[PDB]
Design a protein around this ligand. Sequence first.
Ligand code: TKK
Ligand code: TKK
Ligand code: CA
Ligand code: CA
Ligand code: CL
Ligand code: CL
Lengths: 232, 232, 8, 8
Amino acid sequence: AMGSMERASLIQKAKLAEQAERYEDMAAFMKGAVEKGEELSCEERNLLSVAYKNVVGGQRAAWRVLSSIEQKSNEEEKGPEVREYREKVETELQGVCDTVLGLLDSHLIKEAGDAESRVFYLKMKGDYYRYLAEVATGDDKKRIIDSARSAYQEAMDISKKEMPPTNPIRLGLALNFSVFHYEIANSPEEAISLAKTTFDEAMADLHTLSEDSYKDSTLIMQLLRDNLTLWT
Amino acid sequence: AMGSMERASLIQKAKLAEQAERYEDMAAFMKGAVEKGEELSCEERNLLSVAYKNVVGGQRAAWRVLSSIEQKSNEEEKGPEVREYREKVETELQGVCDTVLGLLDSHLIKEAGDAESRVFYLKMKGDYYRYLAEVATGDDKKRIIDSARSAYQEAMDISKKEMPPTNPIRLGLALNFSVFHYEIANSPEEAISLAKTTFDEAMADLHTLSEDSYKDSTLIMQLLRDNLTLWT
Amino acid sequence: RRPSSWRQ
Amino acid sequence: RRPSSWRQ
Ligand SMILES: *Cc1ccc(-n2ccnc2-c2ccccc2Br)cc1Br
Ligand SMILES: *Cc1ccc(-n2ccnc2-c2ccccc2Br)cc1Br
Ligand SMILES: [Ca+2]
Ligand SMILES: [Ca+2]
Ligand SMILES: [Cl-]
Ligand SMILES: [Cl-]
């Protein structure tokens, strides 16, 4: 649908959509930009991530509201409407996750050769499989969970070899993989260990950073600390 | 698109969509309910209003962001993208207003015989013409403004004859007509006069109300006072 | 700022 | 509550 718009115009419009809090539009513009077939710059990758995280974040929040209402109903024997509407929102959410995973597979990941881009996209792949796992209940749920795990693990392996422990994408990846362990894989000890080791190794590397890099890294470290406080 | 769903199921799903903050879905469910052809109850009218006010409210906020960016551009000679995207959001907004006005015209207003329902729908008609007027610039702008004025005026005439001065729909109508005068019709003195007379006549009628009705009426009176403080 | 219209 | 994943 965006095939007739210039790549640069799609990027410009994605930035305007962000300013206007029109995240569905922002995601459609960035999907159009990805489909031009060129690699994405650092800023462009962030626009893609922000757009879809906001879209799927609203869907996940709505799914959780409806799932809670449905659970309370299954404990007055009301009709099919709550389940039907939860299923409608769930199918929409799955469609957005499949769209993002499709962009990563065709062909963002295979062309990403630098560590920063490859880790970024593998983290995204883990995240969107994690969102699929949050709603999964059927024959393929274990395979969805393993797909998230595998993507996060490859990203971790690259990040530990190629990036300093304070690198914001490395930190955000570890944060999200720890959430995966706690919330999805039923491995709270692994989640806590990962968050603590990540925090401590970043702390020891802050001395190398400029004031601006220090601000970026410590912001994510605080999220790790917030989870450790919640979990311990 | 909602033709195969039961009226009661559409209403139930609109309430679930409200709880999940899925206002586009809520509006689609309520449009489906209106199109069943039966009159709407008091609660159902409020669901219809809440749904579309939230949808169009997000569009208006985005339009204002983009219009401000476009104005700053027209004072580096950038390309067509800001105007194009503002126009896209504007066309979407106009489409939602036309949808609401179409429901009112086919056939909510003509079947509304009680003062409460008729005033409610005429207030809505004024509001959605007012939103069209906020973005209007062409040959028909004066006619759009007059359409808003005419709908508000008929609602006012009915409300003054058939409702007490504290009735919440009467108060909200007067609030919105005063905003029309200030923001759309370039009549700040008329806006101030209307807000003051409405506030004073409601104050004099509070003594007749229960505690719960008093709370409803004074909430809207405070909005009138907030505007008077802003305008004087 | 902009004035207040009806809102709940 | 739910834990914090990355967010800006
Ligand atoms: C998942 C994650 C973690 C950190 C960031 N982040 C924070 C500050 N800069 C960045 C960043 C990292 C990689 C590419 C672009 C950017 Br703006 C972002 C994300 Br999605
Ligand atoms: C425009 C307006 C003004 C007041 C209300 N309101 C406030 C409390 N109850 C009501 C009301 C009025 C008429 C029908 C239903 C309801 Br819940 C609502 C509105 Br849209
Ligand atoms: Ca490459
Ligand atoms: Ca009737
Ligand atoms: Cl549904
Ligand atoms: Cl556009």
